[PDB]
Symmetry: D2
């Protein structure tokens, strides 16, 4: 392995071009993003055989400083004329490879720093403020992009993946976990009605990576919409396990968004122990599941 880069490149832009014209779906009110405030945390990794002597000889001649990579990202956010994190990563990646001919590969992560609307009163009327926003430490959209320079000097996206991270959902009833293996190691009781508490990371890949950019917004899949599909499916499903739940969420996603090729899940079980009905936090060990649904 040989690469290097910069992490935790926070960048906040005001008044990015708004994202409008999205295709709505039944599960979600989402219809675009005002982009009064657009926050992203970027990580950049780069590689190329020509970097070898920066390691083996201490030769910094071909080292773009990681501090300069941070400047590069923040300055490109000031000039970005598009409307999504996905498109912003493509802009940064193409621009970086065009600038630095000795770089052969670039990997980018962008994580949304989300902000929510707040109430303000003007002339007695309460409505969403256009100035004051609330920083959210809950779920957030993500985007990943890998681009390479080929032998013929063409640039090519070899991987692209969008996502929703940090979704923590609890359903108070209508969940069971029964029928699992009972042997010398099994102490868990069957439960026909548990308050299933899952953490979800959900990632999707497009059949056509250009759909991820938002330039034709009707083909863009929004993390907000994915969130609302997950809650809808959770609500309507008498779940039989987390495994069963996440399969059904994935099927619904792929039904609503035929332009997607796959949906990938990382889920964690954080269900409370049962002590009106009162529950409490469990000991630290947590179950998890990882599963891809394909179109």
């Amino acid at each position: 392995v040989m690469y290097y880069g910069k992490g935790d490149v926070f960048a906040y832009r005001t008044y990015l071009k708004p994202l409008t014209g999205v295709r709505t779906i039944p599960e979600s009110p989402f219809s675009g993003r005002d982009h009064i405030l657009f926050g992203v945390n970027v990580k950049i990794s780069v590689g190329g055989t020509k970097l070898l002597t920066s390691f083996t000889k201490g030769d910094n001649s071909l080292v773009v400083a990681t501090d300069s990579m941070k400047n590069f990202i923040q300055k490109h956010l000031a000039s970005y004329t598009g409307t999504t994190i996905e498109g912003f990563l493509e802009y940064v990646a193409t621009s970086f490879l065009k600038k630095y001919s000795h770089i052969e590969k670039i990997s980018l992560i962008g994580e949304e720093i989300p902000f929510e609307t707040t109430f303000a009163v003007k002339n007695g009327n309460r409505a969403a403020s256009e100035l004051v926003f609330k920083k959210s430490r809950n779920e957030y959209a993500t985007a990943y992009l890998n681009m390479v320079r080929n032998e013929d000097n063409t640039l090519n996206i070899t991987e692209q993946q969008s996502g929703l991270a940090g979704l923590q959902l609890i359903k108070v009833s209508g969940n069971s976990f029964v029928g699992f293996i009972r042997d010398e190691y099994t102490t868990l009781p069957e439960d026909s009605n548990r308050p299933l508490f899952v953490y979800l990371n959900i990632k999707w890949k497009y059949k056509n990576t250009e759909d991820s950019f938002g330039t034709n917004p009707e083909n863009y899949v929004a993390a907000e919409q994915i969130r609302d599909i997950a809650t809808s499916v959770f609500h309507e499903t008498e779940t039989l396990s987390i495994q069963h739940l996440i399969y059904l969420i994935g099927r619904r996603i792929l039904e609503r968004f035929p332009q997607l090729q796959e949906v990938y899940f990382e889920s964690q079980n954080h269900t409370w122990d049962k002590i009106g009905k009162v529950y409490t936090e469990p000991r630290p060990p947590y179950g998890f599941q990882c599963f891809t649904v394909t179109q």
Copy 2:
């Protein structure tokens, strides 16, 4: 000092009696709490001169196990018939002192564990779920109560305070910080238009402690309402400092709730450095302010 207790007593109650009958204010849609899911994180501390030999001699005869205090709290959440964290603390405090004659003082903290509603579709109709909720790591309500046993064996609440913790607000424009002292230690440039980013912890005390319990809901002050006052005042104010903002928030709160005696603020400055406009995270050191507005 001599006391002991139990922290991080998480307890989750389903279907607590709903909080209804509250007074609604223009700044906030708040009109009560459904209480399908009621989460609280409780800290209990107890004292009394008869505890002395548990320390000085290793005598456990008068030690209620801290583990038992956890059981006490969780069982009392199961039997609580009221509608507020503040009232639940009074229930626990009175019950504990009635149970254990050798305890002279009990302090309680209750911190809301907040859950937000989610969307679900049924037969082409999208609505709030009554089953699926989203765990929030953003702002949360708080309550504090200290109760003592007097020499005539009556019980007396000696301090009560409610609050809202963890509110993080950024206003993109309409904020200035100018006119401060410039001397050998001053490098901060004056700024007539900064995207002020404040963390707020807001606490209030009632003129009459009974109003905190929710027995008469018309007199209850909800943390949700405090939040929306704070965002509305931030929106409308051309801020001149954080100090200036929190004073005005406090005045508005006391105007809206004449049953309150005081509002106390703990604020922090997390405003980004300026690099379309793009900003980035500052170095770790953070400004802060602490101020009481009284009625």
Copy 3:
């Protein structure tokens, strides 16, 4: 209440004057501090009635910017010629009140950012490096100071406290917790031999505030020494409770340091749950705690 200030003022100084000439105790090999690297995390709070209109009117005329307080602290660590965090706080506090005559009260916290020695081979042998240090996220020393300006413009310290925070100690045997109240709220089994795991914050106050500064280092009480008393007493004692343990630690501290007026404990119980060999695991989140003062 009315005050404001700056938190998380990190400041790393190289080659501070070393702390030597300390007085030893049986429980500790501590003999001083090299101070090749001296890290401290400072919080400053200031007050004064003349700050009122910065809140009530948005008048910044008498506001020292909190950013300037950061500069103030960092610049004073560069000029500090003493040997302790405690003395550094007195230097900052006196300097700040002299500089800003409208400020009536200043409160300072300083938390050590500790670094540990590492090994290097050079010139034929392995020895402690004078250049490479390891950042520790374990226990750390603390200091607290409050100073006021009186009507006549003199300055006075009104509270001083030193401490050791974040000490996490587990003793695998030789601890019991029996004989506690067993009633309708009790499900805890009695345990005659538990692996007691305590978190300890330990804070001490001097009879004479001057002794906290290090100027006469023989009167200084080092957090390293307090750590070593705590581990020794934990080892020595067949404990009967955390309560029992911390009283005994406190008594040993005040016996070893007669210049101390008192020692205050915040302890927490993190003892593991028991499942050929003995195995334990992490408990549920709820944690017991004790707060207790032993006085001279």
Copy 4:
């Protein structure tokens, strides 16, 4: 992708068989591990085509409960008779695949929960306690293992890797970063003498997986020894970059441990910003990093 499992399976064992008979190196005094307290945090992931209907149909007939996996791990730590985390993972993995014939693959991560010695006075002298230990939140050893079941029901290790995580080292002088690209994105000054502060995660792979277990301890590579190589090479080296340093650390590791095939680094730059004495402070959050393998 299809797998499921259990994370944060903390397990603490007392009086595991000690690790001794190790082979020493010049950079390190490491001579073994007492194992009075042996703490590990385990993550287990399992897979197999026969699990499909647990997702597609909600059929749990072939689901080992993740809670049962936690019991499996903890009980196996009680019966483990070996001396390393690496060997513990092999014991768990082999045992789990033998128990559950429908599971085709298991991956395990084991992270050390490290404890440090403390001082106690008893019977006239101060010495290391055999009972009281200090929980450390600094660097820690790691182990990774993947095992598969073949068509003929034999089991094979398919990947093994050991490591040291969380090592945070600052060298106060004797580091430069100069000569890098200065173009329209460059605002970093050249620096001929910086206090380079790196975080290091170092992972190694053996030529022969058996050498990772400790059964013949002379062939085991201890994380403690890797730590001490890293601190020695950092001290010895007038560093020209983090990239330069980690290559030199990796070369030394491979020279000292010919039984290793390769060593892999993840480093992060956390060097302080410079504000009488020299004073530095914490930087803004963005951090540089490097990922690099040195092979034998």
